[PDB]
């Protein structure tokens, strides 16, 4: 089935987050994990895999054992938004971001044109690019937000110019979306936020459309 689009007061409001939006911003700045054609070299818990990506140990956490079992010792590409603070390990941590390398490579990059709406109105479109036939939503989300942070100040040091935001992925009939804003209160926990990626959700890079819906204050 397709995910119902956000309800009236379902989306997090940035004005109700009173901590430093910097802690969200830094997740969608230049720093990120990207590795091509690598295989796991260790494992901590039964739902993670450790990769060597100088080389750092990257702990990739999945939602369950089935996903870790699937990719253990398979040659993959890894792409995602990593964190350090309270990274539990025994170095950096991330969730998901894993795609089989073999059979998934494109000769030429595919472009996906993000459509950006502000209060319902399309003011901006821009392309993200990938070499992958099947690509994680995480990778596409990161690339989309990276552009919006640089160019639209999506996240600033203290807060955002936007009250709400969600990113919507559409593949033919089916769609799903992520809330782009922090939960309310004075703390932002990066590990909790990023866990949304632990399902390793994948989309087809030819068919997927990306729509971002922002509201202003």
């Amino acid at each position, epitope marked *: 089935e397709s995910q119902p689009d956000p309800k009236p007061d379902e989306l997090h409001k940035s004005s109700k987050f009173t901590g430093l939006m910097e802690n969200m911003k830094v997740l969608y*700045d230049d720093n990120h994990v990207s590795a091509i054609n690598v295989k796991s070299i260790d494992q901590f818990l039964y739902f993670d895999l450790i990769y060597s990506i100088n080389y750092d140990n990257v702990r990739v956490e999945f939602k369950n054992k089935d996903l870790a079992d699937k990719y253990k010792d398979k040659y993959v590409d890894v792409f995602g938004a990593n964190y*350090y603070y309270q990274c539990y390990f025994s170095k*950096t941590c991330m969730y998901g971001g894993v795609t089989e390398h073999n059979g998934n490579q494109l000769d030429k990059y595919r472009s996906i044109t993000v459509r950006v709406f502000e209060d319902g109105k399309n003011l901006l479109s821009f392309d993200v690019q990938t070499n992958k036939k099947k690509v994680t939503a995480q990778e596409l989300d990161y690339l989309t937000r990276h552009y919006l942070v640089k160019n639209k100040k999506l996240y600033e*040091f203290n807060n955002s110019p936007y009250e709400t935001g969600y990113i919507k992925f559409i593949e033919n009939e089916n769609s799903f979306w992520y809330d782009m804003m922090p939960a309310p209160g004075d703390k932002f926990d*990066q590990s909790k936020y990023l866990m949304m990626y632990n399902d390793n959700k994948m989309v087809d890079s030819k068919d997927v459309k990306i729509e971002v819906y922002l509201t202003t204050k």
Partner: nanobody
Amino acid sequence: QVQLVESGGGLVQPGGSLRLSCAASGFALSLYVMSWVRQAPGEGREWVSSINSGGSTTAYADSVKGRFTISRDNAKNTLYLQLNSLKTEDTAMYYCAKSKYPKYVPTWPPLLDEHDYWGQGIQVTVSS
């Protein structure tokens, strides 16, 4: 291995200007808030200034605000401090300090104890 090496600084008359430079190696500067702290004779460490990883946000101690400017160049892995309108009270060893927390900012401005590496330091003297 993590290294911070301060250079520049020096001796100047009151009202003058100096510049400090810190070359970072063994880590990516871009992951870290960076700070300048100083230690004047017979004093404890004093926080002077901080800059976030991006470069968009700077903070200064009251005593130096409007006179000093912190900046960074992540590509060159360097932190800078411009010291203008110097006063005798500014005489001190100056140290470049790295946040203990990659990709995370618990407090702004940062606390002195939220740094975990320092260089050997560079002398600034405003000669009386």
